[PDB]
Design a protein around this ligand. Sequence first.
Ligand SMILES: [Zn+2]
Length: 60
Amino acid sequence: STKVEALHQNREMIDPDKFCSLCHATFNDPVMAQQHYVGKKHRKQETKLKLMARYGRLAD
Ligand SMILES: [Zn+2]
């Protein structure tokens, strides 16, 4: 995970490190990050976690 640090913008695009708190997933490229945030697995797990948190109010 140390990576071959160079960041040479001559032909390579910007590659920020990113994370998803709904799916517990990490990304290290622009398209990798973007693809996660719009994929079926992100939608499905977002609904699952949202339902778990919303319905979890079993006491008052
Ligand atoms: Zn996600």
